[PDB]
Amino acid sequence: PATKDIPDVAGQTVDVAQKNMNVYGFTKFSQASVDSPRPAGEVTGTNPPAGTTVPVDSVIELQVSKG
């Protein structure tokens, strides 16, 4: 369907990140925990990464800090 640029959601909680993803039409997410300096629970980034233009039916992986 339509394509859309993936928002930057670095630093957001998974709850918040998904709501902002939804605003762009993205609803399908996978998740993986990664070690990071960010507080546990915060998104460190996504795959595809922020700024990528993809179809809104794309699955977006949220990489999530576990500290």
Element (H, E) at 37: none
**Fold type of domain 1-67:** Trypsin Inhibitor V; Chain A (3.30.10)
How is residue 23 written in tokens? 């605003």
Neighbours of 43 (CB within 10 A): 24
Length of the chain, please? Answer: 67
Burial 5-33 (b: 16+ CB within 10 A, else e): ebbebeebebeebbeebeeeebeeeeeee
Cβ-in-10-Å burial (0-12, 13-18, 19+) of 54 comes to middle
Q: How far apart are CA 14 and CA 20, in angstroms?
A: 10
Q: What is the resolution of this structure in A?
A: 2.0
HSE on the CB side for 65, CA within 13 Å?
A: 17
